[PDB]
Amino acid sequence: VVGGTEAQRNSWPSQISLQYRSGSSWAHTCGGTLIRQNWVMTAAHCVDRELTFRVVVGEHNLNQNNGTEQYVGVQKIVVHPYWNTDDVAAGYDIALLRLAQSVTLNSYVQLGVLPRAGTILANNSPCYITGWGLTRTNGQLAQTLQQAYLPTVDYAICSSSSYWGSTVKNSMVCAGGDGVRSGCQGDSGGPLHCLVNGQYAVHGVTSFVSRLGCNVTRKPTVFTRVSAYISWINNVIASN
Numbered sequence: 429v430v431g432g433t434e435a436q437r438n439s440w441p442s443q444i445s446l447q448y449r450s451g452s453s454w455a456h457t458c459g460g461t462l463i464r465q466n467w468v469m470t471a472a473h474c475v476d477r478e479l480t481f482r483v484v485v486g487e488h489n490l491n492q493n494n495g496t497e498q499y500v501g502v503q504k505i506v507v508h509p510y511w512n513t514d515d516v517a518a519g520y521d522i523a524l525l526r527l528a529q530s531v532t533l534n535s536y537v538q539l540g541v542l543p544r545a546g547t548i549l550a551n552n553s554p555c556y557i558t559g560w561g562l563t564r565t566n567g568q569l570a571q572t573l574q575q576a577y578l579p580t581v582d583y584a585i586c587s588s589s590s591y592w593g594s595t596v597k598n599s600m601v602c603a604g605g606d607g608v609r610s611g612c613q614g615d616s617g618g619p620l621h622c623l624v625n626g627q628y629a630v631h632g633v634t635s636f637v638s639r640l641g642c643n644v645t646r647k648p649t650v651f652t653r654v655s656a657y658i659s660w661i662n663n664v665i666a667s668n
């Protein structure tokens with residue numbers, strides 16, 4: 429997250445760190461959202477490489493023991509059947525991870541609330557991105573979880589020629605684009621939390637930023653629209 433602030437320890441309890449085995453240590457690669465005690469929602473592009481993955485729930489500082497973490501392996505990976513790694517712009521950037529063990533819920537570990545199917549946010553709706561991604565374009569990952577206020581940019585504006593044009597689809601949510609605040613590499617897969625009827629709900633799964641850089645004016649961060657995939661999510665969870 430570029431232009432973020434350190435989140436409080438118990439603000440976003442559905443946020444997880446998706447990590448891969450490197451030698452005899454582990455490395456953060458993406459975020460995700462805990463949606464069931466044994467299921468995580470993330471981006472499909474986060475699992476394109478054939479690596480060994482684990483999920484960390486209750487995490488705040490990647491480089492130190494926080495005394496609240498639970499570490500669990502990934503037992504099954506279900507990517508949307510229409511996903512294509514060579515066309516992130518086609519959409520379908522979503523995947524569900526079945527955990528090897530069900531995690532224990534507490535004030536640091538909670539399920540994310542998802543929107544009702546078909547819900548679209550009005551332009552400029554209040555949302556926050558969270559993650560341990562780069563803190564600057566071509567920078568380094570954050571040690572502590574970061575948050576940034578990123579208001580939505582509706583489809584008509586986002587798909588206009590000076591913004592993302594045809595690259596953005598109605599199956600996606602755009603947010604930010606002020607040139608200062610944005611998601612960045614390593615935030616992919618995590619949540620976009622938006623305030624609706626007094627409750628924060630996870631409306632986006634972080635998907636991409638410009639090739640020019642993370643925080644680029646009129647290139648808002650782009651997310652998979654969770655409310656377009658509610659039937660798919662329920663269908664996968666019910667048949668596994």
Ligand SMILES: *C(=O)[C@@H](CC)[C@@H](CNS(=O)(=O)c1ccc([N+](=O)[O-])cc1)C(=O)O
Pocket residue numbers: 457458473474475476477561611612613614615616617634635636637638
């Ligand atoms: C996500 O972090 C976005 C920017 C918000 C970028 C792509 N994702 S990534 O750099 O985290 C990533 C993770 C894992 C894989 N993989 O397993 O192939 C690939 C990329 C971005 O748009 O550059």
Ligand SMILES: [Ca+2]
Pocket residue numbers: 487488489490491492493494495497
């Ligand atoms: Ca830690």
